[PDB]
Each structure stands twice: as C-alpha cells, then as structure tokens.
Design a protein around this ligand. Structure first.
Ligand code: CA
Ligand code: CA
Ligand code: CA
Lengths: 144, 144, 144
C-alpha cells in the first residue's frame, strides 16, 4: 500500500536526477546503458582504470545505436575514443575485455589491419573503427 | 523484510546524488519539481526541444515558490527566461503548453500587452513576467 | 513479482547516476557516506550553511578511510578544509556539531593547542588536523 507510493516517488526522483545530468550533457542514455566521459584523453589502460574506479567499464558499442551514441561523444570532444575490446592471438579477431568475441563491428573500410600484436580499437569521429596501438591519447568514455 | 532495508538504502542514495547536484548548483528542488538549466540562451522552440530531449519540460511556475525558484536561476545567469506558456487566440489569454489555461500569474504591472499574435512569456530577473516574441535568446530552464 | 524487477532497474539506475558523478569527480563514496565540494573557500558557519542547504552536513571523518577521502579533496583543491567539530568549554576537547564528543582524531603532532576559546578544526592537505579560528577561508566539503 505504502510501497506503491514510495516506488513512484523514488522513480520520479531518479528520473529527475538523470534528467539533470542529461541536460547538463554529463551523460547519454541508450537503452539500459549510460555513457559518460570526463573529457580526459589518456591511453587504454589508463581509461580502463578510470571507468572501473567510477564503478563502470570502458565503453563498447554492441548495437548501431550504442555505436552512434559514443560517436557523438567522440565528435563533441573532437577526439578519438578507445573501445572496450582487444585483438586476440589470431590477428584480425578481437574480443570483449571479459573474453567473449566481438559481435557488432563498424570497421572503417579495409579495417582491421595493421602492424602489431594485441592491438586496441579506436573510434573515428564518424563512428567507424580502426585498430592500432594502445598507447595513444584517446577520449575516456565509460558505460554504466 | 529485505525490502524495508533496500528501500532505505535506495532512498539514502537518491538523497545523496540529489545532495551532490544541489551543492554543485546544478539543480533546484521545489516540492516535487526539480528545475535546472545548462546555462544556454536560445529561443523558445529551441528551449522546448532541449528540455524534452533531457526527459523534462520547459519550466513553468504554478506557485509563488516555484516562480521565485526560476527567478533565482534567471538572476544567477543574469538573463531572462522563457516560460512554459503561450498566448491563446483571444489576446491577453495564455495557456500551458498542453492546453490548460494559465492559473498562477506574475505579470509585471500593465502586462500582458504587446504587438503580436501567439506571443511567448519571458521572466525578468525580478520574477515578474512580460509577453513578447518567441525568437529572443533566453536562458533555457527545465523542470523535471 | 514485479517488485523484484523494478527494484533491480532502480538500483541499476542509481548506480549509473552515481557512476557518472564519480567519473566527473563531483563526489567520493566511502562506505555509506558521500563527500562532495563545490570548490568554494569560505569560513566555517558559511560552510555549515551551504551543506545543510544542499541537504547534507559539513564533512567530518570518523575513520581513517573517511579522513583520507577528505584529505584527497583538500589536496585536489590545494586548500585546507574545515571539519564538522568544535572545541568544547574545557580546551583540548572537541565535539561533533550535534554534541557527541569526537571519537576518531588525526591531530598533527602537538595539536590540539592554540590561543582561543571554541576553536574550529582545519585539515591540512596531508590529512592531519590543526585547531584554530573559524573565520578563515576553507574548502567547503559536505557529506551526505
Ligand atoms: Ca588499423
Ligand atoms: Ca509585453
Ligand atoms: Ca592549533
């Protein structure tokens, strides 16, 4: 009886706080995922660290819509973004950080291809991907 | 049994996040309404768009307290604010965006009055209102 | 049946908003406490006011971990922080704002000591404390 009311007020309040964050441009909601960046441009590992420290994970799009969302953040900060995936042993193949193998992909024509073992994946401001070193300075985007 | 505890922790956490946003000056709470602006000064339609895109609606005070809250944001950013209301067909009469007719009002002495059909409503930094064109650049304030 | 799902989505959402705030560096979570500052440097009373106005209270560490958390904020803004405690009648003794007597302490060697009745407590960027006047300009840190 009380529950119903409380759940309502709680939901309203969460929507309000998320509404404020969205309006401030501090986050992007896409389905159940929330993307956000603190505007910093660091290398891969550094990014992984920050995201996990905030309670999240380095972003990785698993659908065209998620991909576009990250691309808009890349565009907004005019910088490339490191994605949550790395090249397996057998070149040309990449996997999600946990271990699963990349499902959705948006490689720029001709990619993946490059000199290097265990390469990272950066996203161009147009959304397409490119594989390369993990020591560049990329916009740190996280997903929660 | 578990519920009671969880609801408590959830409420605490929401209060914390709202407390942080309030302290940062990112929002103002007045009753069940939360007001917020991203500091941008755009015309009416533009404002409507932004607010709805964030999951909210262009602000509209329905009580002296709500009115003052928006006025403080107008004062803080030293800019006038477009309110969520527009002039009906029969001049001098305004309605809430949905359709209902404006209830609470705080017109500046002598207002409303002006050359124009379907005019917008701006709030002066002192809180009083004035009706005029919808193409000026006003502080975008939303309510959630 | 529905509850279980809703509680889950609600928890997820709260974690997301807190994750965004953490990533933006707007807050620090330590156990059930959340610390945050709006970067302002004001005197004691002023600080008390701001925190309560935001729905919180001037920060006070009650454990080494809380202490370090506030110290990191002090370090980040390169400014000393006023803590939530004041000297009792009998010099050398301090109490929490409510009234309870200070439990955890991290005085800088030789402290507390100084000319003054009812003194405040500032935290050095290294985390140790020092008692002195309440009219200095210190970083306003709140806990929620
Ligand atoms: Ca490549
Ligand atoms: Ca007028
Ligand atoms: Ca002293």
């Amino acid at each position: 009886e009380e529950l119903q009311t409380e759940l309502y007020e709680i939901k309203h309040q969460i929507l309000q706080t998320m509404g404020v964050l969205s309006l401030q441009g501090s986050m992007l909601s896409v389905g159940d995922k929330v993307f956000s960046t603190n505007g910093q441009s660091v290398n891969f590992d550094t990014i992984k660290e920050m995201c996990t420290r905030a309670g999240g994970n380095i972003a990785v799009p698993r659908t065209p819509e998620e991909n576009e969302a990250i691309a808009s953040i890349a565009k907004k900060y005019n910088n490339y973004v490191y994605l949550g995936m790395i090249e397996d042993q057998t070149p040309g193949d990449f996997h999600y950080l946990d271990g699963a193998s990349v499902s959705y992909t948006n490689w720029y024509p001709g990619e993946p291809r490059g000199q290097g073992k265990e390469k990272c994946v950066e996203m161009y401001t147009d959304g397409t991907w490119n594989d390369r070193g993990c020591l560049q300075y990329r916009l740190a985007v996280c997903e929660f």
